[PDB]
Symmetry: none
Subunit: 84 residues, 24 copies
């Protein structure tokens, strides 16, 4: 399997609904309003960002900034362990 | 390619379901019930209005009226930017 | 652009869910149960009443009676303003 | 053009699918089961009833009864306007 | 117009979805499983029962039993009104 | 005209596609595959059965068995009315 | 030219293929199987019936029976108009 | 009139093209190819069978076998009715 | 002008080729094969039957039987009209 | 070159097989069966009608009736132009 | 030149083979078989009728009956013009 | 190239199947059932109307009525451009 | 009348042109080309066979072989009936 | 009528769409993809299984295995009742 | 009107959501997860149990055990009354 | 080798049966029925026309009229090339 | 009658159009294209194979191979029944 | 071989049925109905237009107009390539 | 009579029109064009070949080559049976 | 025997009836109608041309022109082989 | 019937919708987007993976990885029992 | 195997139904209404655009504009890789 | 037997009706219209081309061009094998 | 019979309609539009490719490319087994 897809699945498995709403608000300017209605979990948002080339195996600045804004410093360690 | 179609696509891609329902209610007297049953997004309604000669690159009064009735003042800026150029 | 539809939309935009339930109860003897099951907002009820010729641009008694029963006196002023002009 | 055909087309243009199903149920005793399977809009039903001499430019009682059973009075107003 | 079909249409117009599911459950031994999958309203079930010679203008006992099981005593009054006249 | 042909035409005019498919399956052991490929309505199947002497005015048992297997008790009444008179 | 041939041509010009197949089935006892294979329109069948003395200007009962069996009550009016006037 | 020729004419007047093709195939070992090329109806085949002494007013077994093979049980009744006239 | 020849001409002018072939088949026992080869219309067959005394202006049973076999009931009316007129 | 023959050729050149069959049915009481079996185009039927004095340069009523029965109103204009 | 012979030549020049056969059949009772076997054109039949005193310049009923039987109404106009001119 | 045929081809190229069904219904009194069974596109209907002298370069009222009944106001502009 | 000549006439009266052609081909090694050119019916061939003593009221083997080759089994019955009659 | 076909029709009239899809998946190794594309009810699959000699009046193991895999123990009773009668 | 289906309908009409969830948990080992996902009332579960030959008119042991596990002793009286008669 | 006979042979070598039938119909008033029965190709008709002094090396109007009536414009060019 | 021709007729009477197309494809290297164009049923193909001496009353390997490739075993049973006797 | 016929064959080998029907509609004023009934591919229409001198090796305006009406801009390039070489 | 003629008659009795056309094409370089116009069946072609000394009761190679070209392997067995019988 | 007569026999032995009719038409201006009525094969025509000194063993131009008109280029090779 | 198809059916009949969505996400780089839209149950995904030669009776590593990623350790026991 | 067709197939294999609907709306002015009704995947639209000379191996501006409008920036990388590789 | 005639027969045995129609179209300038009506197979066209000296055993360029235009590359190999064998 | 035809039949028996449409698109530049319009199964496409000499028992590269493009790796195993076992 692709180590990146496993990392994204593990990250999305550890979020609640309120953090999903905060992420949807923070991603307001990049994704259209019609598409944001269909987002019910983190996997859909990650798929859209992957399709728009906002997230790549090697370009993880946007994900790091979003996690820092959510004040979740335990998932950043997982991201860093994957990168290293 | 035809800038009017691009503008209509951009306007349509920024609506939710409730606003589409309000638009369908507001356009009740111009489109028949059987045709209105088949509308699932804004593109279909815009296509019907284009066919009936209600929307033209020079006649945008109906679109402005509908958008002002929906209280969406950010799309009116896009329409004004298109017409200005 | 029909102003009666605009007035109905504006009136429907100011109701909550409990008032909608009260209106559905009050209109129990005019609309069937299966049709009432599909009503989620005021626009659907107004569409049904328009179809049954219970609500007309010249006969607005039923709407006034419903609003008076709901103790909503700020919407009767809008109805009066519409029928004055 | 014949005004009667225009009136029938205008009436048929304002029906949904559920009302068509109700009309097909109500016309169960006059049309056979093989023919009713080919009806997709009101035009086919009106053509069959025209062929069987149930609808005529002078006799419109069956249409009025069906429209009264569907509780559509705005269409009955159209029929009254045509007759006058 | 056949009055029996009018009565059946009027009865079917006053049911909800859960009562339809209960009626489908109660008719498990008379209709096959493949045919019950296509029933979306009461008209289809009534048509099937009419074809299988379970419902007749002179034989209305099964309909009365089903209505009594659903605890709808207002529709039984309509059935009695039809039969008496 | 022949009453038997009128009866067969009346019976064939009341079937649908799925019932025709079921009849074609049930008549697998009497008609060949190449001949069954040409059957589009009930008239063709009845003509073939008439040719093979499986269906006569004095012998209507196979038709009764097929109709009973389709659970159509409103056509057996027609067959009984024809035979009684 | 002969008012009868014009009437027959007018009647035949208003039939589709399914009605032709129904007529061919109903006329199974009067015309042979080899001759019925050559029939593609109503004119051929009418010519055969004219030759066999089944259809005459003074005897039109079989035509009325066939048209009644097809439930085409508008062509019966044409036949009446021809006979009356 | 020969009650046999009338019967043969009546039988031939009730066949289509596919049944004629099937009969021509079944009669492949008795008639030559050049003669079978000229057959367009049942009469043209019955004439050859009469000439070759395969079909007689008292020997009708081949006709019954062919009709049974075609599964036409309503014509065997006509043949039986003719035979009952003796 | 013999009313019989006019009647025979009128009857012969209303037949197609398939009816002629059927008539040729039905007369297989009265006319030879070599003479039947030369028949192209109904006039030749009527001439041969007249020569062999099968058809006379007073005896017309064979013609009616053939016409009934062909199921042409509109020519039997012409024959009846001729018979009743004389 | 006779004007009438050219007109008949022009009229015959604009018909299909179904119209030929309808004309053969409509001309059933005037021509015998044996002769009608030989007709494959309009020229043969026109020749047979010419021989029987049904069609002449001064009497064109039968042709007009046939064309009116076939609902071909564009050839009646040609006939009228020839007559004028 | 004899006008009657010119008229007969004009009439005979406008016939086909089937019409000649029909005329020969209709003239069966007047001319013998052996003499009818030699006829290949209308001129021979007209010559035989002239010899038997059946066609005369003024006794022209048989020709009219034959032409009416053949349904040739355009040659009757030629005959009428000949009679009216003289 | 006759401009009228080009105009008719352009008009027919912009219709769908449901509009074709409505057009067939609206012409019930002018064309017989047997001929209407063989119509699959607008070209056949236009050919029949051309033959019956209902549609000619100087008379285009029936086409305007049909297009107005179908509520297609973008093809009436094409018709007007042709006429001018 | 000679019964043998009557039998030969009856047999020749039931043949067609193609069968005559096949008979001429089969009799190629007994008659010359110039004589075979003159044969138009079966009587001419029978006469030439008679003159050469190939056909005798007691020796009918060649005729039987020809008829068996043509697959005409209904004329062999006629020949057998004639032989048993004597 | 044949009891086996009646039993198969009765069994087929008691299945929904999900069960049909599961049966189509379970019969993947015996029927080709193009043929499985055309199956819309149970009769279409039973016909193919009958043609391939996987289902016979007495070889009912595959049907029982499929019904056991679908966990339908009310139809196995019908199968047992059918088998016990014979 | 099968007395058993009526009994099951009456029993199902007297349950709430928590009891339905408890029954779904207790029936974990006999029904698959994908099918238990679709259960919304007692009728759906009873249909599956009837299909798998676990519940029969002569064998009501599993139903009695499930009812006893919920401490619903009033419904056991209904079951006993049905069994007695 | 008279050029006129060669030209007539070349023209006759390019006609089918239907065109021959049309020519026979158009030449109905100039040649008798008994003579027209014998025509099987264009050479016979051309010989019959030559015998009656209707077709000459100087007077070819009838040939041009017939060819124009058949709508064959590639043979009129051959005639023009011969004449010039 | 020849037991072999009857067997071939019985085999040919139980094939559809698709199987005929597959047989024509499989017999591509034995029969020419112009002759394969004229084949409309199985009888023509069997006649051609009989003429080319590929099918004989004692040599039936090609027929068995073709039937095996079509996956029709009920017809191989018929061939076995013929050969066993 | 003639380049023009090869070009026409190549153009005709790239059309469907609907395009052929559209061409038949667009060519209503140049070819009669009886002739247009016989057209089943583009080769027949090209043959008729060649006979009427509407299509020539030096005059190709009608073909370009038809191809522009059908909106086929890939075949116009083939026509231009043919014309450039000559 | 002569076995070779019987064999040739039997072989020619099993051909059709298309096979005769193919044989005429294949024998193009041996028989002149004026003589091939008169051939209507195989007997005429066989007679011509017999006259030209291409076919003899001991030299049958050309016939075998023709039959092998037509792919008629059932007639080669008849030829082999004739050759082995003598 | 004379080689010229053998060559003429060989040439005549390869012509059908239609080619004979075409040759008779082409030789219309040299032989009378009554003499042409009696020709049934090429030998008669060649003998008639021989009597008139139109065909000689040193002057074969007419034969070459006739054969080239019939488009028989395989017989011209035989003629050339005889001449060489 | 194949012990492998029975095992796959048993595994598929024990999954819910959210697990199916997660499995669809994890197979993003092996199946195209157009084909993943038609997947409504596990049987379709298993059929696609069988056709692409990703699942065989001897190669069960991908299924084990997916099941371990879903944290379903009760189905891995079924897989092990099948293999043993 | 024409790399351009492979690229178009790969691009079409990565779209869904909604994106196809938006593409159909954006290509509203270049394809007629009758033709757009027959489009069920990207291959049909690509075929029409290839015929109308809007897509060529050297001209890919329209495809890039459509992909940019759909906001699919991963397929533009495939297009750029194809262009750079060739 | 002449190898060239056998080769032409083999080539003609593998063509269908549409290819024959295309071949007739491609030879519009070499054969007249009256002669092309009588062509029903490839043998007639080959015979005409042989007569006009367009097709010789040593000159086979036109046949190669026609077969290349039909895009039938499985027959060009047969032609090459014939040429290499000689 | 031929092992190659059996292999092609087996490969064609395991395709659906969408894969057939994709194959038709991928084979756009090798077959004409009018010919591609007549393809309803894989057998027709394989027959056309066999005629054009694109597919041979010794050359199977195009088939492998097409199958790899459809991402069907279970049929490539069958192709490899055929090539290795022979």
């Amino acid at each position: 399997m692709d180590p990146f897809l496993v990392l994204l699945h593990s990250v999305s498995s550890s979020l609640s609904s309120s953090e999903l709403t905060e992420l949807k608000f923070l991603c307001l300017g990049r994704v259209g309003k019609r598409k944001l209605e269909r987002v019910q979990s983190g996997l859909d948002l990650f798929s859209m960002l992957l399709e728009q080339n906002d997230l790549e195996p090697g370009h993880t600045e946007l994900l790091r900034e979003l996690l820092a804004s959510l004040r979740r410093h335990d998932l950043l360690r997982r991201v860093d362990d994957f990168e290293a």
